[PDB]
Amino acid sequence: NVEAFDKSGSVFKGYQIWTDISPTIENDPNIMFVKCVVQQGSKKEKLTVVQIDPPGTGTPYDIDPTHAWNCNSQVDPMSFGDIGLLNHTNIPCVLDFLKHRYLKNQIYTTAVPLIVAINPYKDLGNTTNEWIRRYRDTADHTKLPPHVFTCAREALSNLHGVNKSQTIIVSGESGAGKTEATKQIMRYFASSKSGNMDLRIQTAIMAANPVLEAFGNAKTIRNNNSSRFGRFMQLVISHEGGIRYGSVVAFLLEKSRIITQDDNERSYHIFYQFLKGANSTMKSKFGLKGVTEYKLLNPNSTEVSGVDDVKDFEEVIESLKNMELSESDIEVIFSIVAGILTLGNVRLIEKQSDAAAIMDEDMGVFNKACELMYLDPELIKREILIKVTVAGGTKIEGRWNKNDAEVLKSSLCKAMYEKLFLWIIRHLNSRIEPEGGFKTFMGMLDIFGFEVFKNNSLEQLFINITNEMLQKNFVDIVFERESKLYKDEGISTAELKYTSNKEVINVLCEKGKSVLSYLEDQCLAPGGTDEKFVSSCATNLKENNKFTPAKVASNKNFIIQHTIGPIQYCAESFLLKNKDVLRGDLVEVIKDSPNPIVQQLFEGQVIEKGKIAKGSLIGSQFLNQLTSLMNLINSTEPHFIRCIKPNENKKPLEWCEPKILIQLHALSILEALVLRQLGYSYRRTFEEFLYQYKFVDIAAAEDSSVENQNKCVNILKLSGLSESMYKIGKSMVFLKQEGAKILTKIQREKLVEWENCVSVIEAAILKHKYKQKVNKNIPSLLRVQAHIRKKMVAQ
Amino acid sequence: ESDVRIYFNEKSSGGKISIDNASYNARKLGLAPSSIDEKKIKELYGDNLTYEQYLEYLSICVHDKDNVEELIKMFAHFDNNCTGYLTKSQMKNILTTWGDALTDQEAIDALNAFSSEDNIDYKLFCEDILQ
Amino acid sequence: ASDMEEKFREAFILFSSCSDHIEMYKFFELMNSFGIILTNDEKAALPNDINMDYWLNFAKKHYNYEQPFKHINNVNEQNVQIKIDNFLGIMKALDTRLTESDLNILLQITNPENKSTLNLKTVSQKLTESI
Numbered sequence A: 001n002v003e004a005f006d007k008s009g010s011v012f013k014g015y016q017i018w019t020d021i022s023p024t025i026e027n028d029p030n031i032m033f034v035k036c037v038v039q040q041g042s043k044k045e046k047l048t049v050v051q052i053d054p055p056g057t058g059t060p061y062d063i064d065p066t067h068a069w070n071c072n073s074q075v076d077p078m079s080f081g082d083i084g085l086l087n088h089t090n091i092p093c094v095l096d097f098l099k100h101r102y103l104k105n106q107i108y109t110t111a112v113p114l115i116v117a118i119n120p121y122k123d124l125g126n127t128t129n130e131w132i133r134r135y136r137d138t139a140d141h142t143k144l145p146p147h148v149f150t151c152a153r154e155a156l157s158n159l160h161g162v163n164k165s166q167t168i169i170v171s172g173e174s175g176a177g178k179t180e181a182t183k184q185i186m187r188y189f190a191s192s193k194s195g196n197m198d199l200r201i202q203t204a205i206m207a208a209n210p211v212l213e214a215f216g217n218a219k220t221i222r223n224n225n226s227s228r229f230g231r232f233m234q235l236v237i238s239h240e241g242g243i244r245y246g247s248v249v250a251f252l253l254e255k256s257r258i259i260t261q262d263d264n265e266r267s268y269h270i271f272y273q274f275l276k277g278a279n280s281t282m283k284s285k286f287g288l289k290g291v292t293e294y295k296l297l298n299p300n301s302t303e304v305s306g307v308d309d310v311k312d313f314e315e316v317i318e319s320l321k322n323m324e325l326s327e328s329d330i331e332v333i334f335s336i337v338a339g340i341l342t343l344g345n346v347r348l349i350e351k352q353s354d355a356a357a358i359m360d361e362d363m364g365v366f367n368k369a370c371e372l373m374y375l376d377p378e379l380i381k382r383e384i385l386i387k388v389t390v391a392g393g394t395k396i397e398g399r400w401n402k403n404d405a406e407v408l409k410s411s412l413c414k415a416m417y418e419k420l421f422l423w424i425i426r427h428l429n430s431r432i433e434p435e436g437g438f439k440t441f442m443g444m445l446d447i448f449g450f451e452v453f454k455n456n457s458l459e460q461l462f463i464n465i466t467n468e469m470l471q472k473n474f475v476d477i478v479f480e481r482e483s484k485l486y487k488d489e490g491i492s493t494a495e496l497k498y499t500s501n502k503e504v505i506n507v508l509c510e511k512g513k514s515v516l517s518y519l520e521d522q523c524l525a526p527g528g529t530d531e532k533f534v535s536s537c538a539t540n541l542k543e544n545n546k547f548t549p550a551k552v553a554s555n556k557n558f559i560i561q562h563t564i565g566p567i568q569y570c571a572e573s574f575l576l577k578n579k580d581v582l583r584g585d586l587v588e589v590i591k592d593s594p595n596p597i598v599q600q601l602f603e604g605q606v607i608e609k610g611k612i613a614k615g616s617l618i619g620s621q622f623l624n625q626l627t628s629l630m631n632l633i634n635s636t637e638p639h640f641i642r643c644i645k646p647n648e649n650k651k652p653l654e655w656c657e658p659k660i661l662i663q664l665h666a667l668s669i670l671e672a673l674v675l676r677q678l679g680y681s682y683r684r685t686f687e688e689f690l691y692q693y694k695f696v697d698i699a700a701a702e703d704s705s706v707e708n709q710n711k712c713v714n715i716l717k718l719s720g721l722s723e724s725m726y727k728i729g730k731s732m733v734f735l736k737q738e739g740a741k742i743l744t745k746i747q748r749e750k751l752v753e754w755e756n757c758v759s760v761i762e763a764a765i766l767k768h769k770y771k772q773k774v775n776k777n778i779p780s781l782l783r784v785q786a787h788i789r790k791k792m793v794a795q
Numbered sequence B: 001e002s003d004v005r006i007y008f009n010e011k012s013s014g015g016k017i018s019i020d021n022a023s024y025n026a027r028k029l030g031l032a033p034s035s036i037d038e039k040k041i042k043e044l045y046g047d048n049l050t051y052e053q054y055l056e057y058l059s060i061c062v063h064d065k066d067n068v069e070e071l072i073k074m075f076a077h078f079d080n081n082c083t084g085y086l087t088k089s090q091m092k093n094i095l096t097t098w099g100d101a102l103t104d105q106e107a108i109d110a111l112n113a114f115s116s117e118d119n120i121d122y123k124l125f126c127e128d129i130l131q
Numbered sequence C: 001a002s003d004m005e006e007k008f009r010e011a012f013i014l015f016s017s018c019s020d021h022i023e024m025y026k027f028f029e030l031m032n033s034f035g036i037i038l039t040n041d042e043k044a045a046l047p048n049d050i051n052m053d054y055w056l057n058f059a060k061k062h063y064n065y066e067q068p069f070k071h072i073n074n075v076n077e078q079n080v081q082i083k084i085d086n087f088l089g090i091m092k093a094l095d096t097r098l099t100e101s102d103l104n105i106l107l108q109i110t111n112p113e114n115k116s117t118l119n120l121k122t123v124s125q126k127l128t129e130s131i
């Protein structure tokens, strides 16, 4: 806790610290901490500082020592890739290191086993073919800065090296850079050293990102190209580069977006792409109106800066063709899109207020919508307007009101879209999957990281459930690895134990005693509400501390105690959001379509005769998907890419300390350092330790009369370190972090004689290094001076 | 193009013009000559140049590769927190120390000409001098 | 006669990032670069906010014109050679600001070959030629 004073009790002349107290901090939301120097005369119980960075007034002020943090003064952040290698890993230190690297355009930085990637919001040209080649063909990969290609290389290296499947997991907030990382990593995997015969299957996989972004991405306030779903891929890369087989899985597609969008938010790209992009012939074929002339599409949001939908659309048509879709197949896809868009524009009115019907002006519109969707218009009209209640014993033919028929119409638009999207994926998989399945594959998950908002719904619950499963994966692989290491050197794995989220998993998933188990049972109930669900949850989950109720709206709100903190969810419309799946008889009308693609949309979709079955609901079906997806990932060796959005402004070189720190917490970058420090963290071979800690005791080091495993135990006993800080090991000297830091202090104490010499040496070399950098910029300077003089003549 | 022959005659002596005078003329025309361009022609025709050589010198004084991104390099080098702003004191020390060094007055003048404030946007300072 | 002012001035602005005030830590790098060494008391006695004019005065008062780098090797002592990887051992042990590249640069500049020992009488000698 800040070693600012000498033995005399006097402050070290110039002693720099980090601090959370400054007017700069008050006046600037971007800055969290400032650099200070501890003023001469400062007291032990309370310090007197002066701000040095960012520049200040010079005014001395007081801070309690619990607001002073150690400074990593005199350290080049571009000199090394892991945050853990810093002498001090406190919050302001870790943040600064990340900042300096960011502004020097080094975004990737590890926190073993994590790779932090800060969104530059600018093309750095670090993922070019020239960069893929460098990262692919370099002799010793370690003599290269951290990169997503570092992770892709390492992953493909272990897959082929020990014949074990691998999974790269890209996570973070919306607009942090997951999809871009995912696209870079794939681009690298597609670069072959000498070629690819399975180029047709590779070309189809690469043709899948534009297609998937068109149908699955949208312009949100937070991201202009926001992935509205979870993506999982299984790849089969040749050891010399080149994808050979693949399998794509989309999940949790945002259904609501097809119907309505918030403002400054668009629908799915394809709607915009297709309407601005379709040619004269295409427009008449389907009868297309302008982007503004469609109900399901927010008419204000229609344009996105830097996005050219006409050009993007051309690229989608080519991509669909490269996915081995015929001109007919493509024409069927766009007839279904024109159908979804046209059906939305059908108006419904109350037919007194008893039942409802189609507006006569809109009858042709309705019929065209069904034709385009290759559906029977009469039978579709029937399902939207005829209610078949089962009152008492018998079936009772009744009619749907305006609001209800509007909901069933919207249900069709949504279901038809989602199913078309999933079919496009299913078709791609048919042309890219290996006939007998995957022996050893390369997994790739592009999932939305932990989500916290002002109001959290069922959408964020499913995301935060998935994110709990991945965190379990992190902590288990952290343990597994560090535990196998100790075991191999014959060390006690006893002082090695850390937190399990098993307690919050049970409260969220476990059948019978979980939020999701009581969400399912309430949907299946012949009379269950959002209040009844929370009341049942607050009564049956008192056994674990992870389920807690709410202060304001106690029966409407509930809060779960996640790994990353307490997240409050609003149970309003939770029962509605789980029941949002197409209603049995309409599905039969679709399955009876003459067109082979429309028949294929709802293949084996079991009929909904009575009230919604277990596996029909969104929550139930999703837990099955997640469990299956998880077990497959738990089978592979993981890799973690953590993405950080540095600013809310989508701007380059704009660092925002507070936002960035919430992210360092949610992605466990800080905990990744914590875990790496614990136990016997310093581990280096007998030969290594002796090159390093030679001068602790030069006598025991400089000796032939003793072996290397024994030279070390001599130095260590003589050193002072308690046997409580070091273990000998089989091949490696295992030293605790604290022990290894003390041991260095002993070595420096021995070379007290060398201090002034090494000072002068280092200092002179830096002065030289410094002038050399200034020489590089001297031809540019000569220019500013030539023009200053040119400007002076003109007077 | 004609100003070239107009300016030449004014400082010329027996058909030949001194580099110091030839450089001054290049500035009047709107070109930015450095000690390199002067050492380039000195290395080819001496100190006094004919009309034929004068043009050949103004040919080297044509610096097209000149733009804000190219000029800021040195100022950008000392903007360690990457704000896009340097003090007048910082910028004065750069202009008066390395390269074709300006007088401590020439530097103050040009920085005071651009802004009143101590903190100068060197991207704008460079854009301005180039004009 | 030997006026180091031009060399002192430039060095201050290399460490001070062209500003006219250096922070303590960087002043210590600066003075050390000219072979100056201060005692913990001498240091404690310095002004908290060191400026250009202070440094230039101090530099004149403390720079050893007759023998800079006396701390690497003294010509008035006598015992000046040690193994190459031994030197680097001490360099790394004292947590140098220098990287694996800077260290090797210093090595081929001073040591012409790969001769088993590195002589300090030559380390001081080469650094003085690079003042």
Ligand SMILES: Nc1ncnc2c1ncn2[C@@H]1O[C@H](COP(=O)(O)OP(=O)(O)O)[C@@H](O)[C@H]1O
Pocket: A119, A120, A121, A122, A123, A124, A172, A173, A174, A175, A176, A177, A178, A179, A180, A181, A223, A224, A225, A226, A227, A643
């Ligand atoms: N590595 C990067 N280099 C340049 N721009 C990037 C990078 N990563 C992200 N971006 C920009 O940020 C936007 C949003 O990032 P994206 O990866 O698509 O979001 P998400 O994290 O939600 O998947 C991109 O469309 C792109 O403009």
Ligand SMILES: [Mg+2]
Pocket: A178, A179, A225, A226, A227, A228
């Ligand atoms: Mg995305």
